[model samples]
Target: KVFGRCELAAAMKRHGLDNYRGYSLGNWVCAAKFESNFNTQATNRNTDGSTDYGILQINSRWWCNDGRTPGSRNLCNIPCSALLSSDITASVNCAKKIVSDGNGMNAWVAWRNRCKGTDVQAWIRGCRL
Candidate 1:
């Protein structure tokens, strides 16, 4: 599913992720923008032959099943395609599990490279949350 920035932010806020795990809503919003541009169906093949899935780009190697990747941890016990749904509930829940694993937002390279140490206000700008 495709979403504008404000729409994504509002959905995320309603998902109760505003200050998830001590990270600000801006952090999650900015990371989502950079990671998948708020496209729930987004997927990216990694150099390691793994794939990233959904808005938060959860990895097949450790998180979900992409169907083609063998020996995936499937730590979230969820199908990668489930993350691509417009509902976003599964994806958000899976991401929270990832964050709880002690990696924080550092699990996402987009967060580490782009959203970190930057002004994330633009992600939620005009969202009126």
Candidate 2:
């Protein structure tokens, strides 16, 4: 599912992403924008031989298990397919784990490169709440 910009904002808010780890709503919004463009089924084949899955583009190398990655840790302990669902709950949960697991918002380089140290608040512009 492709989410409207503000629609995703509200959804993430409801999922408790707003300031969840001292990162603002716009931080999550901006990372999601660059990571998957708000598409639930988004996936990317990494040259590292890993597949990035879902809106947050959680990787199989260290997060999810696809039964293909040679050294998957499956840190999230959920099927990788769960990340592909249109419902954002699973992805959100996994993302929280990533952030809480000593990574902070730096888990995704897209967040570091695209979301860090910029006008992150723009992601929530006109999207009240």
The most accurate candidate by TM-score is 2
Among all windows of 10 consecutive residues in model 1, the one with the lowest summed lDDT is 120-129
Local error of candidate 1 at 128, Å? 2.0
TM-score of each: 0.94, 0.96
Cα RMSD (angstroms) for every candidate in the order listed: 1.1, 0.9
Candidate 2: residue pairs that collide? none
Candidate 2 to truth, TM: 0.96
Off by over 4 Å in 1: none
lDDT of 1 by residue, 34-128 (tens): 89998998999998888999999999998999888867899999989999999989998998899889979999898999989999876787878
In model 2, the runs with Cα more than 4 Å from the true position are none
lDDT of 2 by residue, 1-129 (tens): 998899999999999999999999999999999999999899999998999999999999998999889888999999999998979999999999999989799988899998899999999999878
User: Once all C-alphas are superposed, what RMSD does model 2 give against the true structure?
Assistant: 0.9
